[PDB]
């Protein structure tokens, strides 16, 4: 069961620092470089640096100099990456990945030299000046034989928000859209249901919006 398991999503203000961790399971931790690679939303992969677990030596791309601190704890097979003086363009998914320290050895092995063959699942880091805020929830009322109704989840921070309908009972025809990020720094999303127009006068539709970071949980009835 060879795997890298990374710590959970982070939300930080400009100027703060973030510490991402990465725990290895199922292999010899001290036999592989741990590489760190990040990926901004929609963008390409960007190599950040590596650490040797035997010595603790590290190198990193010149643009992260004096900002990135990679460490490890061999007794718990855990690598750490700390990025300081954060800025909004540090918003990205951060990955760790292993590659072998040696191209061969007396142990037979894969020796995928300079190939990053096992990757953590990624850690989302969001850098933003915005402050936590729960959403306003508004119904989008229904006006050929089918109708569309929905909920607008307006002006919240941070991600994520979860939406269901009728406490889970209704999934057919549901489309929850990815959030837009507004110039204000706040997010908005919509969820829409396509429904037989006959049911409109008889059955009830309620969207369940849950925004854990603000303790906001709202069940909005959507009527004609």
């Amino acid at each position: 069961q060879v795997q890298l398991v990374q710590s959970g999503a982070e939300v930080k203000k400009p100027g703060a620092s973030v510490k991402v961790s990465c725990k290895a399971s199922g292999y010899t931790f001290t036999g592989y470089y741990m590489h760190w690679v990040r990926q901004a939303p929609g963008q390409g992969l960007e190599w950040m640096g590596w650490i040797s677990p035997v010595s603790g030596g590290t190198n990193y791309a010149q643009k992260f100099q004096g900002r990135v601190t990679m460490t490890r704890d061999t007794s718990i097979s855990t690598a750490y990456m700390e990025l300081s003086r954060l800025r909004s363009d540090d918003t990205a998914v951060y990955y760790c990945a292993r590659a072998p320290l040696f191209p061969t050895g007396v142990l037979a092995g894969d020796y995928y030299y300079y190939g990053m063959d096992v990757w953590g699942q990624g850690t989302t880091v969001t850098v933003s000046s915005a402050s936590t805020k729960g959403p306003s929830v508004f119904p989008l009322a229904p006006s050929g034989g089918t109708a569309a109704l929905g909920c607008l989840v307006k002006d919240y921070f941070p991600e994520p928000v979860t939406v269901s309908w009728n406490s889970g009972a209704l999934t057919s025809g549901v489309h929850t859209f990815p959030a837009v990020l507004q110039s204000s720094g706040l997010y908005s999303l919509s969820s829409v249901v396509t429904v037989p127009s006959s049911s409109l006068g008889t059955q009830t539709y309620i969207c369940n919006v849950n925004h854990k970071p603000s303790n906001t949980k709202v069940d909005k009835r959507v009527e004609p």
Binding site: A61, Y95, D110, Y112, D117, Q121, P139, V192
Partner: protein, 213 residues
């Protein structure tokens, strides 16, 4: 050193071969036999496909091969299948105890049918209006390929201010979805006879209109 250069996109048909190029400099791709290639599917971590220029990890389809000429490495995929659609990254030891990625290449496998978007436009709710705010919501779904432009109009007048539009995102049925929001004062909303969301996809436009009433 600097990023490796890959084409932004390549495409081929099912059953064909395609080749993706990766140009570096003499001090990385040209000096070492250490190029690796990664396939990344949406929302997944990259997967190693080729290492040391041309070797495949165990379990990786023999349809994938690597090669090099001067400072340019190549990934060739034979017998293209629909699941090969993804972003591909090359990566090289760069010297100076440093690695560097290429910018990545989006590989699209043709034959997936075109589909115009469905557009639903909602006016501001009476609830929102009674809190002195107003948002129009234009929802756009089921289109392929996945690029649309959204323009808004007040009556017949273009509207640039207060528009926020998402990038398109693949939905589970492999078509795409996007949304656009127009923020307005309630005053602005109650004063024009109508507002319109116009979605353009592949040179054709679908338009929805709402009206205070």
């Amino acid at each position: 050193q600097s990023a490796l250069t890959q084409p932004a996109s390549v495409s081929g048909s099912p059953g064909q071969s395609i080749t993706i190029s990766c140009t570096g400099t003499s001090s990385d791709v040209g000096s070492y036999n250490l190029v690796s290639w990664y396939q990344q599917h949406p929302g997944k971590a990259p997967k190693l496909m080729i290492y040391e220029g041309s070797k495949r990890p165990s379990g990786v389809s023999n349809r994938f091969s690597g090669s090099k000429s001067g400072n340019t490495a190549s990934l060739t995929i034979s017998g293209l299948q629909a699941e090969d659609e993804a972003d591909y990254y090359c990566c090289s030891y760069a010297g100076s105890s440093t690695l560097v990625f290429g910018g990545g290449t989006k590989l699209t496998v043709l034959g997936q049918p075109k589909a115009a978007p469905s557009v639903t436009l909602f006016p501001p709710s009476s609830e929102e209006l009674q809190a002195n705010k107003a948002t129009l919501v234009c929802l756009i779904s089921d289109f392929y390929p996945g690029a649309v432009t959204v323009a808004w109009k007040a009556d017949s007048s273009p509207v640039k201010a207060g528009v926020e539009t998402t990038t398109p995102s693949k939905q589970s049925n492999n078509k795409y979805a996007a949304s656009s929001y127009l923020s307005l004062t309630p005053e602005q909303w109650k004063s024009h006879r109508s507002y319109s969301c116009q979605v353009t996809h592949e040179g054709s436009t679908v338009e929805k209109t709402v009206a205070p009433t």
